[PDB]
Write an enzyme that holds these catalytic residues in place. Structure first.
Site: not given
Ligand SMILES: NC(=O)C1=CN([C@@H]2O[C@H](COP(=O)(O)OP(=O)(O)OC[C@H]3O[C@@H](n4cnc5c(N)ncnc54)[C@H](OP(=O)(O)O)[C@@H]3O)[C@@H](O)[C@H]2O)C=CC1
Length: 318
Positions: A17, A19, A26, A50, A79, A112, A185, A219, A265
């Site tokens: 991801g 975001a 950015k 985004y 999206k 979206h 999604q 976020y 992510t």
């Molecule tokens: N369609 C929608 O409405 C939405 C879509 N998304 C999508 O989903 C993607 C994923 O984002 P999101 O769901 O927010 O986050 P995730 O749930 O995928 O990740 C949450 C956290 O996990 C931590 N993390 C990741 N890998 C590890 C690891 N191996 N060990 C320990 N901690 C870990 C990260 O922290 P750190 O960076 O500190 O490692 C991150 O902040 C976005 O980038 C976007 O593309 C997100 C929100 C809404």
């Protein structure tokens, strides 16, 4: 590691991801996308709202230009945002994204949210009280516009995001429907396992693509900062020890074994690389049931600023 969509196209089951947290510039998206590509990721998830599609596109084009990957091996998702759901604005938004990316097509294009907002350059139009200005749109007409985008070759597949069962039905029962959404999604993790919606999607050949698999990036302005941090869950820690992995790997594997396409992510290269290890082990049937027991209806991203919108998707049971 891909699954086949209902339109015949293939999608990698693990996607990165793009975001970012509010405090990140950015340009961070370009850096992370390059790292993700080097780690073996082929699926990248983005969105017009985004406003970093230009950075992600540059990262991908850079890796194509230097010989690392080919366009056909990358699966890119965008999206259309709430302000461009009107039928006459959908294609214009996709064309804008393609210009930002300098791509000829996107692999997947999603609605979206099933909620329209006042059209305009501003992504979050508000009135004098600071409340979002909602708009009414014929979502079936929005879908027809999405279908035309697919027929025009601007996107290979079309789907939706954050739709509930009744909203999916609206599209599925639409008179003249040509293409069913290939996916929905939505947020999904052990505290919000989406058992009901997942079952529904499966029965309709709609793939559930999950975000928030690791608890979301929490976020600011979207996630309650007092909500429990998913990866701190003791059950995930105990299971991580048992399988000799990490809490994150356990959470990712749980979803993959349920037939879900997972997004993830991390701002850290070490973790981006680690997450690819999810393909190396299997959770037992009994342990999958243990993880099924953690459900607690914890929705990290309820899109609270949209509350009051006639189509807010999270009021219904599913
Ligand atoms: N369609 C929608 O409405 C939405 C879509 N998304 C999508 O989903 C993607 C994923 O984002 P999101 O769901 O927010 O986050 P995730 O749930 O995928 O990740 C949450 C956290 O996990 C931590 N993390 C990741 N890998 C590890 C690891 N191996 N060990 C320990 N901690 C870990 C990260 O922290 P750190 O960076 O500190 O490692 C991150 O902040 C976005 O980038 C976007 O593309 C997100 C929100 C809404």
């Amino acid at each position: 590691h891909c699954v086949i969509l209902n339109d015949g196209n293939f999608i990698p089951v693990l996607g990165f991801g793009t975001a970012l947290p509010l405090e990140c510039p950015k340009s961070k998206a370009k850096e992370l996308t390059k790292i993700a590509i080097d780690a073996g990721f082929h699926h990248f998830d983005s969105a017009s709202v985004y406003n970093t599609e230009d950075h992600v596109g540059e990262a991908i084009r850079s890796k194509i230009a230097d010989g690392t990957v080919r366009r056909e091996d990358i699966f890119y998702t965008s999206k259309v945002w709430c302000t461009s759901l009107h039928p006459e604005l959908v294609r214009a938004s996709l064309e804008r994204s393609l210009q930002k990316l300098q791509f000829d097509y996107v692999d997947l294009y999603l609605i979206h949210y099933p909620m329209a907002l006042k059209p305009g350059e501003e992504n979050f139009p508000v009135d004098e009280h600071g409340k979002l200005i909602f708009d009414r749109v014929d979502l079936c007409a929005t879908w027809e516009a999405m279908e035309k985008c697919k027929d025009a070759g601007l996107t290979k597949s079309i789907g939706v995001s954050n739709f509930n069962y009744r909203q999916l039905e609206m599209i599925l029962n639409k008179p003249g429907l040509k293409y069913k959404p290939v996916c929905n999604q939505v947020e999904c993790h052990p505290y919000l396992n989406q058992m009901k919606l997942l079952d529904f999607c499966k029965s309709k050949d709609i793939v559930l693509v999950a975000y928030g698999v690791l608890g979301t990036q929490r976020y600011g302005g979207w996630v309650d900062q007092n909500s429990p941090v998913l990866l701190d869950e003791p059950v995930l820690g105990s299971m991580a020890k048992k399988y000799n992995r990490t809490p994150a790997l356990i959470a990712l594997r749980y979803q993959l074994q349920r037939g879900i396409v997972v997004l993830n992510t991390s701002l850290k290269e070490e973790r981006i690389k680690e997450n690819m290890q999810v393909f190396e082990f299997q959770l037992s049937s009994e342990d999958m049931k243990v993880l099924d027991g953690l459900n607690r209806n914890m929705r990290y991203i309820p899109a609270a600023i949209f509350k009051g919108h006639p189509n807010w998707p999270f009021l219904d049971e599913y």
